Amino acid sequence: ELPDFFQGKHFFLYGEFPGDERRKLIRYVTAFNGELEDYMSDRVQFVITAQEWDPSFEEALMDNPSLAFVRPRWIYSCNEKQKLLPHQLYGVVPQA
């Protein structure tokens, strides 16, 4: 059946996404039993973004440090292996 590695992890798609991508994500997330948020709030553990580092992150960060800023590629490869991959490999850091 369906592997449930996103168990109790909440996501947030931050970017401007290529329409069907958002779908894929959501498909893939919920598919793996991921939780999906409709707004940045304390529940969030991973912010998925195709976009680039945003000042927003920081303030969000300095209010909820646990945050991960991963790029979609993670969510894919995750499925693409049927395993929880360290988001670190697919991270988003302000470049500076």
Curated annotation (Swiss-Prot):
Q: Which residues cross the membrane?
A: none
User: Tissue expression, per UniProt?
Assistant: Expressed in fibroblasts, retinal pigmented epithelial cells and lymphoblastoid cells (at protein level).
What does UniProt say on post-translational modification here? Answer: Phosphorylation by CK2 promotes interaction with APTX and APLF. Sumoylated.
Q: Which residues form a coiled coil?
A: none
Where does this one sit in the cell? Answer: Nucleus; Chromosome
Every BRCT domain range: 1-92
Question: From what superkingdom does this record's organism come?
Answer: Eukaryota
Disease implication from the record = Spinocerebellar ataxia, autosomal recessive, 26: A form of spinocerebellar ataxia, a clinically and genetically heterogeneous group of cerebellar disorders due to degeneration of the cerebellum with variable involvement of the brainstem and spinal cord. SCAR26 is a progressive disease characterized by gait and limb ataxia, loss of independent ambulation, oculomotor apraxia, and peripheral neuropathy with distal muscle weakness and areflexia.
Tell me how this protein assembles.
Answer: Homodimer. Interacts with polynucleotide kinase (PNK), DNA polymerase-beta (POLB) and DNA ligase III (LIG3). Interacts with APTX and APLF. Interacts with APEX1; the interaction is induced by SIRT1 and increases with the acetylated form of APEX1. Interacts with (poly-ADP-ribosylated) PARP1.
Q: State the function annotated in the UniProt record.
A: Scaffold protein involved in DNA single-strand break repair by mediating the assembly of DNA break repair protein complexes. Negatively regulates ADP-ribosyltransferase activity of PARP1 during base-excision repair in order to prevent excessive PARP1 activity. Recognizes and binds poly-ADP-ribose chains: specifically binds auto-poly-ADP-ribosylated PARP1, limiting its activity.
Protein known as: DNA repair protein XRCC1
- Origin organism is Homo sapiens
* Parent sequence residues shown: 538 to 633 of 633
